[PDB]
Amino acid sequence: GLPWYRVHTVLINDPGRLIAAHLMHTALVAGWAGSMALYELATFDPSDPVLNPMWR
Amino acid sequence: TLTYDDIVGTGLANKCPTLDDTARGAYPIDSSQTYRIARLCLQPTTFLVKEEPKNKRQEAEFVPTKLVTRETTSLDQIQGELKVNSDGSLTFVEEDGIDFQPVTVQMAGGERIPLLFTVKNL
Ligand code: CLA
Ligand code: CLA
Ligand code: CLA
Ligand code: CLA
Ligand SMILES: CCCCCCCCCCCCCCCC(=O)OC[C@H](COP(=O)(O)OC[C@@H](O)CO)OC(=O)CCCCCCCCCCCCCCC
Ligand SMILES: CC1=C(/C=C/C(C)=C/C=C/C(C)=C/C=C/C=C(C)/C=C/C=C(C)/C=C/C2=C(C)CCCC2(C)C)C(C)(C)CCC1
Ligand SMILES: CC1=C(/C=C/C(C)=C/C=C/C(C)=C/C=C/C=C(C)/C=C/C=C(C)/C=C/C2=C(C)CCCC2(C)C)C(C)(C)CCC1
């Protein structure tokens, strides 16, 4: 069958499933952005923009 | 003049009586008579908390807060003698009343600040 490094080639001639895979990728990335923001808000100390700003 | 059933649940019970704009007069004090405050009412509108200074030892400011314990904040039904002093000054000596309320306010970021808002032994 297909080697492991070729599994996604099933999408080349399947525009609908390619759109699905792209939707899933987009869902993952947007989910990352959301999760990352939440984790940052759960750890961020807003009490000192002078000596403890976000980049520290 | 309003009854309990007029006031119940409106939030008016936590407000102090007001006087109209026409009330810019003068109440004569007779240094020979004894005086009393029959009712003192204190209705807070703002609670400010002093920020715990970063470490600059610069000006730490009082900042706004959000009241989270509802319309439970006012001091009222406070009474005490109103002394007339030698120098013509008046001294109110609080004796009794509903002279404290526990109050919780919330700082930006979530920190809750409980306080015993009071004038005990004023
Ligand atoms: C954007 C991500 C993405 C998307 C949209 C797809 C989509 C697709 N894959 Mg591919 N795949 C991916 C990533 C992805 N894959 C990764 C990272 C691997 C290595 C594990 C694979 C390996 C793979 C194989 C072997 C096969 C596919 C196949 C397919 C198709 C059918 C679905 C399937 O069987 O998935 C299977 C893939 C998975 C179930 C992904 C693994 C899940 C990982 C472990 C993360 C799970 C999240 C987890 C909850 C978080 C863990 C947190 C941790 C800190 C503990 C479809 C085109 C099939 C295909 O059609 O072959 C012709 C197929 O046989 N994929
Ligand atoms: C938009 C970017 C993009 C897209 C859509 C594709 C899509 C494709 N690639 Mg190409 N490729 C890319 C960029 C991309 N590639 C980059 C940047 C490189 C260099 C690193 C390559 C090098 C490359 C090679 C050498 C090959 C492909 C192949 C393929 C095809 C099969 C993929 C597969 O089934 O893997 C299945 C993959 C797995 C089952 C697991 C992979 C696990 C990886 C290595 C580690 C974990 C990755 C992690 C989950 C991703 C994090 C996201 C990242 C951006 C930070 C498919 C058409 C194959 C092909 O042409 O088939 C005919 C093939 O041989 N790609
Ligand atoms: C009306 C014309 C039109 C419009 C507005 C779009 C718009 C888009 N296309 Mg293209 N496309 C078109 C014509 C169009 N296309 C035609 C005629 C073809 C040949 C069939 C294609 C083939 C094509 C492929 C193969 C792919 C796209 C993809 C995309 C998306 C990429 C960006 C993205 O996902 O953002 C992020 C998304 C958002 C911020 C949300 C947007 C909200 C959507 C539009 C509302 C959904 C409801 C709507 C009624 C149903 C779908 C609308 C559809 C016209 C796109 C974007 C929504 C890619 C995709 O879907 O990636 C996931 C993709 O893989 N298109
Ligand atoms: C411009 C931005 C961008 C681009 C071009 C891509 C492109 C890609 N992404 Mg997405 N991704 C992005 C942003 C992006 N990503 C962001 C911001 C997030 C949230 C963190 C993700 C989360 C994400 C997930 C969870 C997955 C992808 C996957 C993919 C691949 C799908 C096509 C494929 O089959 O490749 C085949 C794979 C390759 C060609 C190998 C790519 C190798 C990368 C570039 C470096 C790998 C590093 C190292 C070897 C392994 C990681 C270290 C390990 C300790 C974790 C493709 C390379 C999917 C994929 O890799 O499926 C197999 C996948 O599962 N991405
Ligand atoms: C965030 C979520 C992330 C989850 C992603 C999951 C990641 C999965 C990673 C897959 C990696 C698997 C590698 C496949 C490995 C594998 O299948 O190899 C053999 C494979 C052979 O492919 P063929 O075309 O012969 O097809 C056979 C098929 O059965 C394969 O499916 O060739 C490759 O894949 C090319 C890569 C070469 C790799 C060679 C390196 C090995 C040499 C030893 C190196 C170590 C020793 C060094 C000493 C100094
Ligand atoms: C369904 C639904 C829902 C929900 C959702 C959700 C809840 C979500 C999510 C999500 C999510 C929550 C997600 C996420 C994600 C993530 C990710 C995607 C990640 C990733 C990662 C990575 C890729 C990594 C990598 C790496 C490492 C690990 C280490 C170092 C290096 C690197 C960086 C490479 C709602 C209700 C709205 C509605 C409708 C339905
Ligand atoms: C319609 C319906 C339904 C549905 C559902 C759904 C749609 C679901 C889903 C779901 C989902 C879709 C989910 C998910 C998920 C996820 C996950 C599992 C994740 C993750 C993640 C992570 C782990 C992360 C992390 C991180 C990052 C990335 C950054 C920052 C840091 C941290 C570490 C936090 C049901 C059945 C209910 C029933 C009725 C109807």
Side-chain angles (χ1 to χ4, degrees), chain A residues 47-48 50, chain B residues 54 56 109:
Chain A
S47 71
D48 185 12
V50 174
Chain B
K54 324 285 169 280
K56 195 177 297 192

Side-chain angles (χ1 to χ4, degrees), chain B residues 13-14 41-44 47 67 69-78 97-105 113-120:
Chain B
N14 194 59
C41 183
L42 292 100
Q43 180 202 326
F47 295 93
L67 175 64
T69 47
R70 310 173 73 190
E71 293 302 314
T72 54
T73 58
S74 290
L75 312 184
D76 204 356
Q77 301 186 45
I78 295 162
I98 298 157
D99 60 8
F100 69 98
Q101 293 295 351
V103 179
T104 303
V105 297
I113 309 293
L115 67 139
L116 195 69
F117 170 51
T118 192
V119 293
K120 279 178 178 309

Side-chain angles (χ1 to χ4, degrees), chain A residues 23-38:
Chain A
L23 282 166
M24 190 58 63
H25 183 266
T26 311
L28 288 159
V29 179
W32 176 86
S35 304
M36 193 73 251
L38 292 170

Side-chain angles (χ1 to χ4, degrees), chain B residues 5-32:
Chain B
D5 291 293
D6 296 320
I7 287 148
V8 67
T10 57
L12 287 173
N14 194 59
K15 295 181 192 295
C16 292
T18 61
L19 300 174
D20 190 68
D21 290 325
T22 59
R24 312 286 174 169
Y27 179 76
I29 299 300
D30 198 324
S31 52
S32 64

Side-chain angles (χ1 to χ4, degrees), chain A residues 1-6:
Chain A
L2 284 175
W4 70 268
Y5 53 86
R6 294 188 190 164

